[PDB]
């Protein structure tokens, strides 16, 4: 699980917070030595697990997102409450962004009836360091 | 970047000897990505012999805008020389790393691209 | 209360964690378009508030810091788990340092007793651009 | 000293210089008070200490330099470079620009820090 130097950010979760959200991903991914085209693609990976969140994310739902540097890899770990199960659809390009751009891409959710209260779907994604 | 003053892209739209060379800046993601679909579709709207969107000051290129990009080379790409402009880690790389980079030209320069479509 | 805008971040409250916060709450300020000298005292002021707090916090009590940038203010809000109730309060430097930095600088705690669980202590400033 | 500060000492016809970048925090405080330490212990007859470098200046810092100035002052011409919003602004805020002579460059300093 997460380490002493990992960060849990929450915000409300919508469109108005995306470009907040770019911009401490990568002060993060500089601040972890990352090179230029790691941070980058840490930013694209992340900016698209948030845009999807947020645009199936409850009026009130916060996005959370944690990120644990490792000695070896970056961990994002993004979710919200959200109203279905296919916030990132299998085979959408989303998928084929995600893929290309980090390590063992999975989505989750907590099984609950999205109609009801929402449910939580989250995004776990890889950035190596090298 | 605050509520009152919210960031958009820049847009500016230049004839370079006959090509048309679309310039953005800023942060392309879903909420300027109206702006950018806009934007295409009225220099397409003027008929050009051919298109160069130079990419050089784009400082995030969301999904969202490489799904424009290629969508652009689909619906003028038989009629129009077609090109872009991207360098480095935020622009061309994610065009290559998701292959569009086979489906339109990709530029260094704009002084390349526009040797490049004629 | 919070604005549509306003961030929380949650980090276990240790020293080296602090060159973190300073360089995530500027990118806050920096985006909010607060100008230099804003956003050198808001990353001072926060910096000062995480530190004093990190010094008197349990050994894995979390730092919590909300950086809520409004339309004409910046409220800042931090608290943890703190073994004493003398976090940090006016004669100073710390506290001559946040009155020199922010508009309404303001603390509190959960008056339970710290040698048992800990005790939360929260300190709340505004820093206006 | 951490990867997070850096420390170079430099002589100016007798003028100790030393300059200070990245970030003065608790982490870093001691390597910073090692280094003015070991100018002070060679008996320079002026030392300017130059924060351009500074990309941020911790409450700690200023109680460093605020203490230096003390300690030395007397025996010992000093000042300081600092300017814009991380190091000026902030030792103004605390009035600490009556503690110490600063200039807003070094060129200011080597030229004002003797007469």
Redesign the interface.
Known sequence: QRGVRAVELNVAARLENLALLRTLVGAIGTFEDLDFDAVADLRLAVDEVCTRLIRSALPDATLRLVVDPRKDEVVVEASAACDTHDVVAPGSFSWHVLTALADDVQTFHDGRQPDVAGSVFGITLTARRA | ???????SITVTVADHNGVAVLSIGG?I???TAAALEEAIGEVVADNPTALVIDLSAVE?????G??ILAATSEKIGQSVKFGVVAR???TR??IH??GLDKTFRLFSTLHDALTGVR
């Open positions: 970047g605050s509520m009152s003053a919210p960031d942060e993601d879903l909420i995030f290129l969301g999904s969202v490489l799904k480095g880690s935020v790389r994610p790393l998701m």
